[PDB]
Design a protein around this ligand. Structure first.
Ligand code: ZN
Ligand code: ZN
Ligand code: ZN
Lengths: 514, 518, 514
């Protein structure tokens, strides 16, 4: 940890982090639906669908251990309501002990197998029932089929969407118990604490992303990474400017020349206690603010105000270290890397046209100072490869063109090894964080031929930027299976005006499945 | 106090002319009933024809000279008309056989002249003084004007006549001489005599504001401007205090300090005070926006129409306040205590600048999410308004070149006024009427307040959905006044005279009248 | 009826209009709150506040005539909920007779004086419940204070927002009963059928606006006006191209030159049965599609896809004819005028630079074909002044600058007569359609001095376009009190994606109170 420089004494010197969240105090109990449902304090919600009958009637199938409640929920009363996805209703009644109880349902539609996006919709409806109601307990009854992974996803999403970030509130009551009734409850029980770990990894990444760039700068972000490593007993090394110069990391150093915050390179290590059978490097893009540099983000739709989110890759990688440090997988050694800097406008900034030398000796002609993420990634990839790992996976908010290709719902994966790419797709399936494979088109490579330097940073002819940037990055991996995840489109949730913490669960499923 | 320089040729003060040639003009008001002596220089009749649009010129005064009277006969004048702003020059020999210049300016056919009408009349008169060498001008009012409008006539004649040559070097105007005497003939002269020296004080407050606004950003920076304010206070015997960065850190003025983080000039907060001898009945804070240059910061002013070359003028609010301090310090009103406040800084691009997305904390403890670094004026004004309210004052009035949207609502002639108290608003509209500086009341629409809701901070600096940005800025400002009558004058559209390529010094007379009226 | 031209046989030949709406089937009853509440049937909603306590607990005071619901409404239950403006909850339960009811509340925040905008939010939250409700009755309990006009505004807004427009389409049932409990119920009763009339005026204007330009064109619009006039027994005349040529309406006819639809000038008249003491012309801008013409709407932000709404003023004037023809004021004669045409790109369109002659003989130099609204209004105003009326009021979606001056909530009013402006502002207050007085600054008039014509259509220097447009219109009224209402910013509800029908209630209040 290093001292964070300040312009004025009011400049903050750390990122505030909440570790002990109210989600962590919630006691979760899972019961088997075969024993019937007890219905007492709090709110009890049934998840009901009607397969094949679009907006069909509600029917409650589980046994309920209360005669008054069973009478309320009989088919004759419930058929006046429907299962349209996301629809919900609240019921109030007195039970067999003459106590008042709150019951309800959320509609899960008429398709038997819910997609990740469907389930999020169900969760959002459920969370509007928790907001503005002081409840001590929620009980959820699954009258719908879900596999183990989708059940976990239900929990993670619930926790994440319910949790509210109030770190930056100044002048401006969570349940204590969650009951779940499900068929074959004993097989779903194992997902509960995994879900709690996954929730905090994602929420932790989200806290880092959402923290503005005066709070979250290269020095305070690397200090947060140190403090994480100390709580988790990971090994850690933060490389500063003198060390970076010695390693000849001139692509990464040039991007950070115009910042008042010194570059800091984050290297965290998890090692398994047993024989190591696989070595992995996870590389996240870490630009704490992206002004564009002398290629300033001034054009309509450039969104300079969103640019604190340009370290979302480093955040996903640190959220992954949290989950890995907590779950403790065997047989694996994982390095978590991020070349952290800030891209600013200064007398000291690198310029359009500058020629700079990366730590593998390749000279690069800078065509646009706003394509800085690929320069910092190029030195981090060289460093990752020198570690002698089996796989290198990077994750980055790299290109705006992602919005035009896959949009805000799916991230793109590119890579040089099909087996690795399949493992990432497999991890997408089991994490329920959607990614789609996109090609590295070798025909475009000639457009990176520089008249003067070994290579151009950008294409002056090809508009397919996310592909061009993957071609550039590929030049910095000589002999290792490598994949690149571009999360520029999926990282920020525009509708809810907050980060998704996207990638933490995807990467962690990758490591654990391996 | 010491102004930092990058090279030794960078200026270390704003040049300021105090004893201007207007101050050397001897002015005498004479009653028209005695008739006009016509003996030297230029004599101009202000003449109308009520009813008859572009009607003929007919002189109504007695003139105590046979020759000049002969020249001014109706038959001779009938070739000429009274269309607003039209003028003519005559040359003749009086009874003492000395050459004499005589003339008229047309004042139209509507016997009640607006502020804009009287401005056209003065402009034509000033064209008659330019490119001529004259020792004496006399003006004969053959029109009806109230006391305020007669004073406006003199203030405007003085301001428009005065030429600002501080930054000329090889191109100083060789042929520029000023009159030494001004005679005015008018009905019931004794009653207008009091307006002469008041006009002279109002002219200078206004010209002084103009000098600071016109001074480029390399002459007028936060250190040199706060230094000029100290000098002004010292000449007037006002109490004064300039708060520096260490004091502003202790006061926790985080919104104001974030704006100046990227500047080579330390933030300086100006606080001057005028206090009447005897009973203080009203305490007022006047707060002026004092951004000495506004580049936009990282939301740089790069879009077509953004006029970054005009942005030395973004301290026009602070100039108005300082010109007001001049008039107040000179005229010495009773029963008031006036605080003249400006949070002065410069909005620049640097490794040190604040960024879009940053969350900063104001001196009242409110956290603010920056959505655009070029909305910097309301961040500075938020901390200045907290400071003003902690002074225990009865009224807070701020004046500011805040939003370019003023050009689309009121344009270049009228300023907009917003506020939280209808009595205060009405006092401002009243002073608008007696100062002849036009203002229009605009609404603070509370339905837009929800668009300032921030997901992370207590409040957003800017709306992402509402385009009525002068209204949104006022709703933002209103959050920094808890329980005091407050009004806000947006002068972004009126401050610069685009036609004449100079400042208006808008606001000095409006604020003084407001103070003196109280 | 004129025949509607068609390019293909599938082109529509009329505007579909619903006259008998489900709102017209609602039986409304108003009871005094001091008597306590009958809650035995249907959905009951309490409007509740907590003055001084930001986000304070809900507390319901009314005595209710049901033991189950009474239990539900006890303080210990309701304090789980808060009063933040627009927040709502509602619960299904069984009443003392084991019939299904539902009960809830809508939060009215912590300030006793509700504004109109505040009241819209309350209504929207109530409407959200209604759009999921199939109980046959709604009871609204006012545990808050509102004046007569605000209560009528509550009803108008409830009816307007509840009603949904399904004319172009190929969960709920509309209620049949509405009960209101409010203090001084006897005085509020006279507001009910006035609200229902104002609601339909506003909805009918809305149906015209929302109808796309292939349904709603100069011929189909003026046909609709004739059918309206017939149903209300108003006098009517539609002026066609040959009559408009005889009348020398050169400015209006030039704007419509490029359209396939002939210009149609609408003139309806209501005349009171008694002595006529005031004569009024209401003139509405009626461009059924504004492409901009050769000055095409191609710049970012020009919103060409919204430009079916450029007949909003005409629609307001026609909604007002409905209300006036229904309510039948005494002592007045009202002329409802619109110069209807469509502004298109064609070999036949007028061009930037054309000099055109208005029906008062003034020659006009066209500087921009997208400032067509004021050309059509110039001839309409001349037409109106020849009728010999006491007051002319025009209403028009005239300048996009309105979004930069007053925004989307308040319209601007400009005029040549202080007393008429005062009556408009007073009607704004009583109709709850907000307007703000803006000046006609005479110093800008010189910017309309054309080198070649009598006058310019636009300024080439002044950016205050709403004022400049008003200066231009003012040249076409010689000696009559006139006011101009610019509703460009307030006519379309961008968040709800539908028209407001703005101006119907303001116009009616103006005519009813004069
Ligand atoms: Zn970037
Ligand atoms: Zn500014
Ligand atoms: Zn139009």
């Amino acid at each position: 940890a290093s001292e964070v420089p300040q312009v004025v004494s009011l400049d903050p010197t750390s990122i505030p982090i909440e570790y002990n969240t109210p989600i962590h105090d919630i006691k979760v109990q899972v019961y088997d639906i075969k024993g019937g449902c007890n219905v007492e304090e709090g709110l009890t919600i049934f998840l009901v669908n009607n397969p094949g009958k679009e907006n069909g009637p509600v029917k409650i199938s589980s046994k309920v251990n209360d005669k008054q409640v069973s009478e309320f929920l009989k088919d004759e009363n419930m058929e006046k309501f429907n299962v349209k996805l996301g629809t919900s209703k609240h019921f109030y009644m007195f039970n067999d002990n003459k106590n008042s109880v709150a019951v309800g349902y959320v509609g899960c539609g008429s398709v038997a197998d819910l997609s990740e996006a469907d389930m999020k919709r169900v969760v959002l409806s459920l969370v509007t029932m928790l907001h503005d109601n002081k409840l001590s307990k929620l009980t959820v009854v699954f009258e719908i089929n879900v596999d183990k992974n989708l059940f976990r996803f239900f929990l993670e999403t619930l926790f994440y969407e319910y949790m509210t970030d109030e770190r930056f509130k100044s002048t401006d009551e969570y349940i204590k118990h969650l009951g779940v009734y499900i068929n074959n409850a004993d097989t779903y029980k194992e997902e509960v604490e995994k879900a709690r770990v996954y929730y905090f990894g994602t929420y932790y990444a989200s806290q880092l992303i959402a923290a503005p760039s005066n709070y979250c700068n290269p020095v305070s972000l690397s200090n947060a990474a140190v403090e994480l490593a100390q709580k988790l007993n990971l090994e850690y090394k933060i490389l500063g400017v003198k060390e970076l110069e010695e390693l000849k990391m001139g692509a990464y150093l040039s991007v950070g020349k115009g910042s008042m915050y010194p570059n800091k390179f984050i290297h965290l290590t998890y090692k398994s206690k047993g024989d190591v059978k696989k070595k992995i490097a996870l590389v996240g893009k870490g630009i704490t603010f992206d002004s564009g540099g002398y290629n300033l983000k001034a054009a309509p739709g450039s969104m300079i105000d969103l640019m604190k989110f340009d370290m979302s890759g480093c955040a996903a990688v640190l959220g992954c270290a949290y989950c890995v440090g907590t779950l403790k997988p065997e047989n694996v050694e994982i390095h978590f890397l991020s070349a952290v800097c800030e891209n600013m406008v200064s007398k000291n900034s690198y310029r359009p046209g500058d020629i700079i030398t990366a730590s593998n000796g390749k000279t690069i002609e800078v065509g646009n100072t706003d394509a800085e993420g690929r320069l910092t990634l190029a030195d981090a990839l060289v460093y990752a490869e020198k570690l002698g790992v089996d796989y290198i996976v990077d994750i980055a908010t790299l290109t705006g063109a992602m919005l035009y290709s896959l949009g805000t719902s799916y991230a793109g994966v590119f890579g040089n090894n099909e087996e690795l790419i399949n493992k990432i797709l497999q991890s997408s399936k089991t994490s329920n964080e959607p990614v789609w494979w996109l090609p590295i088109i070798n025909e475009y490579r000639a457009t990176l031929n520089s008249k003067y330097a070994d290579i151009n940073q950008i294409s002056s002819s090809v508009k397919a930027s996310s592909i061009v940037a993957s071609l550039f990055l590929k030049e910095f991996v000589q002999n290792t299976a490598w994949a690149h995840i571009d999360i520029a489109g999926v990282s920020w949730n525009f509708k809810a005006r907050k980060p998704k913490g996207f990638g933490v669960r995807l990467l962690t499923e990758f490591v654990l499945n391996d």
